[PDB]
Amino acid sequence: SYYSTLQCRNNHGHCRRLCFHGEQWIGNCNGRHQHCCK
Ligand SMILES: CCCCC(=O)OC[C@H](COP(=O)(O)O)OC=O
Ligand SMILES: CCCCC(=O)OC[C@H](COP(=O)(O)O)OC=O
């Protein structure tokens, strides 16, 4: 329930529903529609 979020944040990412301009969607975080944006 936490490891995808942690892996995202440990690899320069932030969990968002929509990535910011210039960010890449590299995986998902935990929780619904929470996307890892780097
Ligand atoms: C508000 C979440 C608090 C943790 C929880 O209830 O566990 C359920 C899921 C488990 O992780 P998933 O990525 O499978 O949703 O956590 C995320 O909502
Ligand atoms: C139906 C579950 C969708 C979760 C997903 O990872 O993929 C779809 C994403 C969901 O994120 P949204 O921000 O669009 O809701 O859509 C991206 O375009």
Numbering used by the authors: 1 to 38
The authors write:
Defensins, a family of cysteine-rich cationic host defence peptides, are a major component of the innate immune systems of all plant and animal species, however crocodilian defensins are poorly characterised. We now report the functional and structural characterisation of Crocodylus porosus β-defensin 13 (CpoBD13). We now show that the saltwater crocodile defensin CpoBD13 harbors potent antifungal activity that is mediated by a pH-dependent membrane-targeting action. CpoBD13 binds the phospholipid phosphatidic acid (PA) to form a large helical oligomeric complex, with specific histidine residues mediating PA binding.
Consequently, we determined the structure of a CpoBD13:PA complex, which was refined to a resolution of 1.45 Å. The asymmetric unit features four CpoBD13 protomers and four PA molecules. Examination of the mode of engagement of PA with the different CpoBD13 chains revealed the presence of two different PA binding sites. In contrast, the type I site features contributions from three different CpoBD13 chains. N30 from chain A and H21 from chain B contact the phosphate of the PA headgroup. Furthermore, the crystallographic symmetry mate of chain B (denoted as B’) also contributes via R9 binding to the PA headgroup. Three additional contacts are formed by S1 from chain A, which forms hydrogen bonds with two oxygen atoms in the acyl chains of PA and the linking oxygen with the phosphate headgroup. The type II site involves contacts of R17 and H35 with the phosphate of the PA headgroup. An additional contact is formed with N28 and a carboxyl group of the acyl chain. Intriguingly, the structure of our CpoBD13:PA complex revealed the existence of large and continuous helical oligomers.
